[PDB]
RNA sequence: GUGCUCGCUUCGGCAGCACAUAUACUAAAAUUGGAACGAUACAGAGAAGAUUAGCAUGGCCCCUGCGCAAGGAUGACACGCAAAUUCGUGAAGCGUU
């Protein structure tokens, strides 16, 4: 049982450190910055997870679900206009991809 | 500072002219931090039973070496409840239009 912050910080320090390891050991497949994103989610701090998925997408900007989750996270957390700008820039980067026009017409 | 001035004009002073023209990470310091093995306890060396040669691979890991040699335990690390987009059948019971 976890008490105030501070061991909720060392928690925090623990995690980070393994997925930033995950990330150091492969740097390829996408399954460990997804999963860093998403534990990065579920704590509401989603400006860490936003740049979580801005290096993933520099690390491979052809994976088409890592767009998608980028963009569902954005919709998830109310940011309107955020993933507006994710699904713009999207269509743009991967036009023959139809998942992202489909769902942004959505 | 020195020399020359048919300079006052004595050997005292003054005037003029000429040459000579910008050192220093400025400390004999005050400070400020990160650091020497190595001792202290712990700690024990990969490959599916055991005993073992090793060669790699990757990088916010280095050491020895002049080394693009070779060593450092195969130098160490790497050991992961390894889940990434997107579902449908058939009957059976219950309630409903
Ligand atoms: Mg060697
Ligand atoms: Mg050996
Ligand atoms: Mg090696």
Known sequence: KITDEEEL?????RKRKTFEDNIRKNRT??????????????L??????????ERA????????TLW????EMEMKNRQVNHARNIWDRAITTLPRVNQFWYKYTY
Do not use: G
């Not at 998608?68 to 963009?71: I, V």
């Open 68 to 71: 998608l989750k980028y963009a």
């Open 29 to 42: 497949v996408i399954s460990n910055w997804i999963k860093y994103a998403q534990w990065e989610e579920s």
């Open 57 to 64: 997408l520099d690390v491979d900007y052809r994976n088409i």
């Open 44 to 53: 509401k701090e989603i400006q860490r997870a936003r740049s979580i998925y």
């Open 9 to 13: 910080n060392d928690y925090k320090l």
